[PDB]
């Protein structure tokens, strides 16, 4: 006989141990990561000298 195996949702929730959660219920917003940047402040006045 042939039987279905059942909902693999909780097994998948324990399969993502080490996976950084993002959100995409409105947009696709990530809230992890980094970006290198060259901060070039040539023309940066003081406002008060």
């Amino acid at each position: 006989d042939v039987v279905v195996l059942g909902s693999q949702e909780g097994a998948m929730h324990t399969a993502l141990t080490g996976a950084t959660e993002i959100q995409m219920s409105s947009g696709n917003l990530l809230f992890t990561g980094h970006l290198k940047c060259r901060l070039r402040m040539d023309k940066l006045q003081l406002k008060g000298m």
């Binding site: 693999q8 097994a11 998948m12 324990t14 141990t17 080490g18 950084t20 959660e21 990561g33 980094h34």
Partner: protein, 72 residues
């Protein structure tokens, strides 16, 4: 099943904590020790097998911890 291969050692991590930090970080260290306190026979017999083959103490401890680890 899919609940094994749990996406751990493949980089991609940052300052933000994961889906299971402090929960999926000690669960492989609890159920081994629970298996030791609920199945002592392979622990004594694995200690005898590790003590038998192995010349130094470091190899006996190494084969003991590995044989203790491979069993569920």
């Amino acid at each position: 099943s899919v609940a094994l291969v749990p996406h751990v050692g493949m980089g991609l991590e940052t300052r933000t904590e994961t889906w299971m930090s402090s929960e999926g970080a000690w669960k492989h260290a609890q159920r081994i020790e629970t298996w030791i306190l609920r199945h002592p026979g392979f622990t004594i017999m694995a200690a005898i097998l590790a003590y038998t083959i192995g010349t130094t103490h470091f190899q006996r401890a190494l084969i003991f911890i590995l044989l203790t680890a491979v069993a569920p």
